[PDB]
Amino acid sequence: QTVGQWLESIGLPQYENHLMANGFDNVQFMGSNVMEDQDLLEIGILNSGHRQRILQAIQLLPK
Structure with missing residues (x-):
């Protein structure tokens, strides 16, 4: 989704x-690109955690 x-x-x-805001979309593409x-x-993701x-979230997305 x-x-x-x-x-x-x-x-x-x-x-x-x-x-x-960062023009980031398609978590999959992201996790497969960035x-x-x-x-x-x-x-703007501050908290290192x-x-x-x-x-890890993007890593969770299939390659």
């Missing part, structure tokens, strides 16, 4: 708008 449940799945809401810490920062979770 669209970016949301993915964030909710990792239990990290409020990152959807963030992704959108994998980096800075990117988490790009979207969240960043790590998001990093």
Whole structure:
């Protein structure tokens, strides 16, 4: 689906708008295209735990 449940799945809401704000969409494509810490920062993901979770979140998305 669209970016949301993915964030909710990792239990990290409020990152959807963030992704959108960063023009980030298609978590899959992202998880299959963009994998980096800075990117988490790009979207404004501060909390490293969240960043790590998001990093793991994209990793969770099939390659």
